[PDB]
């Protein structure tokens, strides 16, 4: 009854061979995933729930179909891959606090991240390739306190109780991203969460379009018509005139196959959310 297609995943992210389950490998897989499979919410934007977080489902979409996905799909996929390689992986859930006002109400658990034990290394590592444009680009120690360097900007974990907060030093300013606990979550709990993010009419991922990817030199983030690119020394902002140009970017810049949404009128839906 099947067997995990580890090679097909490695292929999708521009790698080959079979690596040791060690820290170097973890860094390499994260960087390759970052530049290869984009963040995207086309399914929930178009009314297609993200309901099934099985390995079969996630491989079918993100590996076999040249689609990206959102957090549950990204970290879901990478979690399966890492376990197959010999890492030990717990799935964690988190509340997003990025740019939220001070006494804003508690957010829902909408984010899934990984806590990974690496053979030959002490403690555990926070791995997150699913947060979008500002996602972690290296694994970091799941250790509260210290500023940690990454392929890009410094990040830091702090703890108040069992609640951990991840922050990024973004263009000089520390910005909280999300909070989480270290309680391992079963698949079904993640699936309830993904049902919510992918179908609730108030969800950021149902009300507009988000597409992102992160290379060695740049973070790319598209929300509606607005493309923001953060590079060393400069930021670029491209404001697309219409959905036609947005679709061209989806296909041509971000490499997403819209042929897989044939029959749904992607352009007409995109045309509705240019400014949301």
Residues 40 and 129 in one domain: no
Q: Is 71 a catalytic residue?
A: yes
Backbone angles phi, psi at 51, to 5 degrees: -115, -30
3-state secondary structure the chain: CCCCCHHHHHHHCCCCCCCCCCHHHHHHHHHHHHHHCCEECHHHHCCCCCCCCCHHHHHHHHHCCCCCECHHHHHHHHHHHHHHHCCEEEEEEEEECCCCCCCCCCCCEEEEEEEEECCCCCCCEEECCCCCCCCCCCCEECCCCCEECCCCCCEEEEEECCEEEEEEEECCEEEEEEEECCCCCCHHHHHHHHHHHHHCCCCHHHHCCEEEEECCCEEEEEECCEEEEEECCEEEEEECCCHHHHHHHHHHHCCCCHHHHCCCCHHHHHHHCCCC
Name the token pair of 125.
């590592």
Q: Which residues contact 137 (CB under 8 A, 6 or more apart)?
A: 30, 31, 34, 150, 151, 152, 214
Among 33, 74, 111, 152, the one annotated catalytic: 111
192 with 82, same domain: the answer is yes
Decide the pairing of beta strands 163-170 and 173-180. Answer: antiparallel
Q: Which of 186, 203, 222 is the last residue of a domain?
A: 186
| CATH code, domain carrying 134 | 2.40.128.150
Print the domain residue range for 65.
1-86+187-276
Cross-strand bridge partners of residue 117: 88
Domain boundary among 134, 159, 186: 186
Verify whether residue 111 is a known catalytic residue: yes
210 and 175: one domain? no
**Method used experimentally:** X-ray
Catalytic residue among 128, 152, 164, 230: 128
Are 95 and 177 in a shared domain?
yes
Give the C-alpha separation, 169 to 156, whole Å: 8
Cβ contact 193:112 at 8 Å: yes
Is 200 marked active-site? no
Are both 46 and 11 inside the same structural domain? yes
């Amino acid at each position: 009854g099947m067997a995990m297609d580890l090679g097909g995943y490695l292929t999708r992210i521009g790698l080959d061979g079979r690596p040791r389950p060690d820290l170097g490998t973890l860094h390499a897989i994260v960087a390759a995933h970052n530049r290869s499979i984009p963040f995207e919410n086309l399914d929930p934007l178009l009314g297609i729930p993200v309901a099934d977080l099985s390995a079969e489902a996630l491989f079918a979409k993100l590996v076999d179909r040249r689609r990206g996905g959102y957090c549950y799909e990204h970290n879901g996929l990478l979690g399966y891959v890492l376990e197959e390689l010999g890492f030990e992986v717990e799935r964690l859930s988190g509340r997003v606090v990025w740019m939220r006002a001070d006494d804003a109400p508690l957010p829902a658990q909408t984010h899934n991240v990984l806590s990974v034990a690496v053979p030959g290394a002490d403690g555990r590592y926070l791995v997150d390739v699913g947060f979008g444009g500002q996602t972690l680009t290296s694994p970091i120690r799941l250790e509260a306190g210290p500023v940690q360097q990454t392929r890009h900007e410094p990040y830091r974990l702090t703890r108040h109780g069992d609640d951990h907060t991840l922050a990024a030093q973004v263009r000089g300013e520390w910005q909280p991203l999300y909070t989480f606990t270290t309680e391992p979550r079963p698949r079904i709990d993640l699936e309830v969460g993904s049902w919510y993010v992918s179908t609730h009419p108030g969800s950021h991922f149902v009300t507009g379009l988000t597409v992102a990817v992160v290379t060695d030199d740049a973070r790319y983030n598209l929300r509606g018509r607005n493309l923001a690119v953060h590079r060393s020394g400069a930021t670029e902002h491209i404001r697309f005139d219409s959905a036609a140009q947005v679709l061209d970017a989806i296909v041509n810049r971000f490499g997403i196959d819209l042929g897989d949404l044939a029959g749904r009128d992607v352009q007409a839906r995109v045309a509705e959310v240019l400014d949301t």
